[PDB]
Amino acid sequence: DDDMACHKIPVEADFLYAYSTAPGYYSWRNSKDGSWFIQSLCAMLKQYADKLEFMHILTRVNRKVATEFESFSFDATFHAKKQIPCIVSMLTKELYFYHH
Amino acid sequence: DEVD
Amino acid sequence: SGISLDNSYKMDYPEMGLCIIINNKNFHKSTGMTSRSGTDVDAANLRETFRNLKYEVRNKNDLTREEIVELMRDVSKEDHSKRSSFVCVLLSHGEEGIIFGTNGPVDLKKITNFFRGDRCRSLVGKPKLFIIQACRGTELDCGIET
């Protein structure tokens, strides 16, 4: 036992990586509207940053990208494809962009 | 739509 | 005072913090990498979004691998004591674990290591957010009907 454990934190703690796509996968961009992920991230931040914790905002981004987007391509290899973003959290607390 |  | 809870990051420092946006659109011809059309739409959207969240936004365009590393090193050496958080957005070509400068790759670990708790003391205990718009490989998701 070591009650002085709380005197250190891991050097990798308090990072959050919001990846546009799952490990191993391509990430989709639209030449006119921008990338699927960044489009969706900005929309959800504008709508919910005064209302929801950040992980719940990013979960809404996951749902938006997963449900509303599908690729269109003349190349069968790249046509009708889907994307899911990937939230990687080493955070130790809830993150709200607003304060009291 | 393009990949990158 | 009364009973206290410590479940959320302190976000009422004088400043929300920096939001660094690295927007790589045009790549050196020798790399063989295509232009990322539409990425300026992303960078502008992010600039406006994080401006409204009261971040100090810095937009950088078309950085070499050496410039990306120098920028991250310099930012990690700033005094963040009055800032609540740190945000970095990377818009580029990529592979698993890798983001591309205009002339070649940068390991994502090299970028994030500058902000490790033992290397950036004024961000210790504060959220460090990395938003990465880049490929992580070449797999395609065919989806399934619902």
Side-chain angles (χ1 to χ4, degrees), chain A residues 7-21:
Chain A
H7 290 46
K8 296 206 294 190
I9 59 162
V11 302
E12 301 275 9
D14 304 308
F15 284 80
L16 180 290
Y17 312 86
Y19 293 97
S20 64
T21 198

PDB file of all heavy atoms in Angstrom, chain A residues 7-21:
ATOM      1  N   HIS A   7       0.222  11.267  -4.877  1.00  0.00           N
ATOM      2  CA  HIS A   7       1.158  12.355  -5.090  1.00  0.00           C
ATOM      3  C   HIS A   7       1.713  12.366  -6.506  1.00  0.00           C
ATOM      4  O   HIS A   7       2.260  13.391  -6.928  1.00  0.00           O
ATOM      5  CB  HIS A   7       2.294  12.277  -4.067  1.00  0.00           C
ATOM      6  CG  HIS A   7       1.866  12.601  -2.669  1.00  0.00           C
ATOM      7  ND1 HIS A   7       0.729  12.071  -2.097  1.00  0.00           N
ATOM      8  CD2 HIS A   7       2.420  13.404  -1.730  1.00  0.00           C
ATOM      9  CE1 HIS A   7       0.600  12.533  -0.866  1.00  0.00           C
ATOM     10  NE2 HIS A   7       1.614  13.343  -0.617  1.00  0.00           N
ATOM     11  N   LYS A   8       1.586  11.262  -7.247  1.00  0.00           N
ATOM     12  CA  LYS A   8       1.948  11.230  -8.657  1.00  0.00           C
ATOM     13  C   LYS A   8       0.732  10.873  -9.499  1.00  0.00           C
ATOM     14  O   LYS A   8      -0.179  10.175  -9.043  1.00  0.00           O
ATOM     15  CB  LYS A   8       3.048  10.207  -8.959  1.00  0.00           C
ATOM     16  CG  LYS A   8       4.384  10.504  -8.296  1.00  0.00           C
ATOM     17  CD  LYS A   8       5.552   9.896  -9.066  1.00  0.00           C
ATOM     18  CE  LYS A   8       5.518   8.376  -9.037  1.00  0.00           C
ATOM     19  NZ  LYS A   8       6.781   7.775  -9.590  1.00  0.00           N
ATOM     20  N   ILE A   9       0.738  11.353 -10.737  1.00  0.00           N
ATOM     21  CA  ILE A   9      -0.232  10.913 -11.739  1.00  0.00           C
ATOM     22  C   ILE A   9       0.543  10.333 -12.915  1.00  0.00           C
ATOM     23  O   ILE A   9       1.708  10.699 -13.141  1.00  0.00           O
ATOM     24  CB  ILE A   9      -1.153  12.057 -12.194  1.00  0.00           C
ATOM     25  CG1 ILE A   9      -0.340  13.207 -12.787  1.00  0.00           C
ATOM     26  CG2 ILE A   9      -2.059  12.503 -11.046  1.00  0.00           C
ATOM     27  CD1 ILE A   9      -1.191  14.137 -13.623  1.00  0.00           C
ATOM     28  N   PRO A  10      -0.052   9.436 -13.691  1.00  0.00           N
ATOM     29  CA  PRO A  10       0.645   8.918 -14.872  1.00  0.00           C
ATOM     30  C   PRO A  10       0.953  10.038 -15.857  1.00  0.00           C
ATOM     31  O   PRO A  10       0.170  10.976 -16.029  1.00  0.00           O
ATOM     32  CB  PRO A  10      -0.357   7.916 -15.463  1.00  0.00           C
ATOM     33  CG  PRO A  10      -1.341   7.624 -14.364  1.00  0.00           C
ATOM     34  CD  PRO A  10      -1.401   8.872 -13.533  1.00  0.00           C
ATOM     35  N   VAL A  11       2.109   9.932 -16.515  1.00  0.00           N
ATOM     36  CA  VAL A  11       2.460  10.956 -17.491  1.00  0.00           C
ATOM     37  C   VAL A  11       1.543  10.905 -18.701  1.00  0.00           C
ATOM     38  O   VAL A  11       1.422  11.903 -19.418  1.00  0.00           O
ATOM     39  CB  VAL A  11       3.938  10.843 -17.912  1.00  0.00           C
ATOM     40  CG1 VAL A  11       4.837  10.958 -16.688  1.00  0.00           C
ATOM     41  CG2 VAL A  11       4.201   9.555 -18.682  1.00  0.00           C
ATOM     42  N   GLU A  12       0.860   9.783 -18.927  1.00  0.00           N
ATOM     43  CA  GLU A  12      -0.077   9.665 -20.039  1.00  0.00           C
ATOM     44  C   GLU A  12      -1.508  10.025 -19.655  1.00  0.00           C
ATOM     45  O   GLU A  12      -2.394   9.965 -20.517  1.00  0.00           O
ATOM     46  CB  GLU A  12      -0.039   8.245 -20.617  1.00  0.00           C
ATOM     47  CG  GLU A  12       1.324   7.808 -21.133  1.00  0.00           C
ATOM     48  CD  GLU A  12       1.595   8.239 -22.565  1.00  0.00           C
ATOM     49  OE1 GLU A  12       0.804   9.035 -23.120  1.00  0.00           O
ATOM     50  OE2 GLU A  12       2.608   7.780 -23.133  1.00  0.00           O
ATOM     51  N   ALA A  13      -1.760  10.405 -18.402  1.00  0.00           N
ATOM     52  CA  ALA A  13      -3.105  10.762 -17.975  1.00  0.00           C
ATOM     53  C   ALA A  13      -3.517  12.123 -18.533  1.00  0.00           C
ATOM     54  O   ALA A  13      -2.673  12.971 -18.849  1.00  0.00           O
ATOM     55  CB  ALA A  13      -3.193  10.789 -16.449  1.00  0.00           C
ATOM     56  N   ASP A  14      -4.836  12.302 -18.670  1.00  0.00           N
ATOM     57  CA  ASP A  14      -5.491  13.561 -19.041  1.00  0.00           C
ATOM     58  C   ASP A  14      -5.293  13.913 -20.511  1.00  0.00           C
ATOM     59  O   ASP A  14      -5.351  15.086 -20.883  1.00  0.00           O
ATOM     60  CB  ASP A  14      -5.047  14.720 -18.139  1.00  0.00           C
ATOM     61  CG  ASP A  14      -5.278  14.419 -16.667  1.00  0.00           C
ATOM     62  OD1 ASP A  14      -6.418  14.035 -16.315  1.00  0.00           O
ATOM     63  OD2 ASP A  14      -4.320  14.563 -15.865  1.00  0.00           O
ATOM     64  N   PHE A  15      -5.085  12.905 -21.347  1.00  0.00           N
ATOM     65  CA  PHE A  15      -5.148  13.047 -22.796  1.00  0.00           C
ATOM     66  C   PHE A  15      -6.469  12.496 -23.312  1.00  0.00           C
ATOM     67  O   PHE A  15      -6.998  11.507 -22.798  1.00  0.00           O
ATOM     68  CB  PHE A  15      -4.021  12.285 -23.486  1.00  0.00           C
ATOM     69  CG  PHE A  15      -2.673  12.944 -23.398  1.00  0.00           C
ATOM     70  CD1 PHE A  15      -1.910  12.828 -22.249  1.00  0.00           C
ATOM     71  CD2 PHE A  15      -2.150  13.628 -24.480  1.00  0.00           C
ATOM     72  CE1 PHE A  15      -0.657  13.397 -22.165  1.00  0.00           C
ATOM     73  CE2 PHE A  15      -0.893  14.209 -24.407  1.00  0.00           C
ATOM     74  CZ  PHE A  15      -0.144  14.090 -23.245  1.00  0.00           C
ATOM     75  N   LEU A  16      -6.983  13.129 -24.359  1.00  0.00           N
ATOM     76  CA  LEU A  16      -8.126  12.628 -25.107  1.00  0.00           C
ATOM     77  C   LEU A  16      -7.755  12.703 -26.578  1.00  0.00           C
ATOM     78  O   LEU A  16      -7.330  13.761 -27.055  1.00  0.00           O
ATOM     79  CB  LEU A  16      -9.383  13.450 -24.794  1.00  0.00           C
ATOM     80  CG  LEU A  16     -10.749  13.156 -25.443  1.00  0.00           C
ATOM     81  CD1 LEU A  16     -10.834  13.482 -26.931  1.00  0.00           C
ATOM     82  CD2 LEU A  16     -11.168  11.755 -25.180  1.00  0.00           C
ATOM     83  N   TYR A  17      -7.892  11.585 -27.288  1.00  0.00           N
ATOM     84  CA  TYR A  17      -7.651  11.538 -28.728  1.00  0.00           C
ATOM     85  C   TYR A  17      -8.993  11.301 -29.402  1.00  0.00           C
ATOM     86  O   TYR A  17      -9.612  10.250 -29.211  1.00  0.00           O
ATOM     87  CB  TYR A  17      -6.643  10.442 -29.090  1.00  0.00           C
ATOM     88  CG  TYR A  17      -5.392  10.453 -28.238  1.00  0.00           C
ATOM     89  CD1 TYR A  17      -5.362   9.794 -27.023  1.00  0.00           C
ATOM     90  CD2 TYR A  17      -4.252  11.144 -28.630  1.00  0.00           C
ATOM     91  CE1 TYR A  17      -4.233   9.803 -26.211  1.00  0.00           C
ATOM     92  CE2 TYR A  17      -3.106  11.151 -27.819  1.00  0.00           C
ATOM     93  CZ  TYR A  17      -3.112  10.477 -26.615  1.00  0.00           C
ATOM     94  OH  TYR A  17      -1.988  10.474 -25.796  1.00  0.00           O
ATOM     95  N   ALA A  18      -9.458  12.280 -30.170  1.00  0.00           N
ATOM     96  CA  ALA A  18     -10.699  12.141 -30.927  1.00  0.00           C
ATOM     97  C   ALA A  18     -10.300  11.851 -32.372  1.00  0.00           C
ATOM     98  O   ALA A  18     -10.013  12.763 -33.152  1.00  0.00           O
ATOM     99  CB  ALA A  18     -11.553  13.396 -30.796  1.00  0.00           C
ATOM    100  N   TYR A  19     -10.256  10.560 -32.714  1.00  0.00           N
ATOM    101  CA  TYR A  19      -9.902  10.140 -34.066  1.00  0.00           C
ATOM    102  C   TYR A  19     -11.121  10.153 -34.971  1.00  0.00           C
ATOM    103  O   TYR A  19     -12.226   9.785 -34.562  1.00  0.00           O
ATOM    104  CB  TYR A  19      -9.319   8.728 -34.071  1.00  0.00           C
ATOM    105  CG  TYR A  19      -7.984   8.555 -33.388  1.00  0.00           C
ATOM    106  CD1 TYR A  19      -7.912   8.092 -32.083  1.00  0.00           C
ATOM    107  CD2 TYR A  19      -6.798   8.815 -34.062  1.00  0.00           C
ATOM    108  CE1 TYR A  19      -6.691   7.881 -31.459  1.00  0.00           C
ATOM    109  CE2 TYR A  19      -5.577   8.621 -33.447  1.00  0.00           C
ATOM    110  CZ  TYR A  19      -5.528   8.164 -32.151  1.00  0.00           C
ATOM    111  OH  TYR A  19      -4.310   7.958 -31.521  1.00  0.00           O
ATOM    112  N   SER A  20     -10.898  10.514 -36.230  1.00  0.00           N
ATOM    113  CA  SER A  20     -11.992  10.579 -37.185  1.00  0.00           C
ATOM    114  C   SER A  20     -12.506   9.206 -37.590  1.00  0.00           C
ATOM    115  O   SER A  20     -13.628   9.107 -38.097  1.00  0.00           O
ATOM    116  CB  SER A  20     -11.536  11.337 -38.426  1.00  0.00           C
ATOM    117  OG  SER A  20     -10.485  10.635 -39.090  1.00  0.00           O
ATOM    118  N   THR A  21     -11.721   8.152 -37.370  1.00  0.00           N
ATOM    119  CA  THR A  21     -12.049   6.845 -37.912  1.00  0.00           C
ATOM    120  C   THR A  21     -11.459   5.754 -37.024  1.00  0.00           C
ATOM    121  O   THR A  21     -10.598   6.008 -36.176  1.00  0.00           O
ATOM    122  CB  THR A  21     -11.556   6.738 -39.365  1.00  0.00           C
ATOM    123  OG1 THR A  21     -12.217   5.648 -40.021  1.00  0.00           O
ATOM    124  CG2 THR A  21     -10.041   6.563 -39.432  1.00  0.00           C
TER     125      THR A  21
END
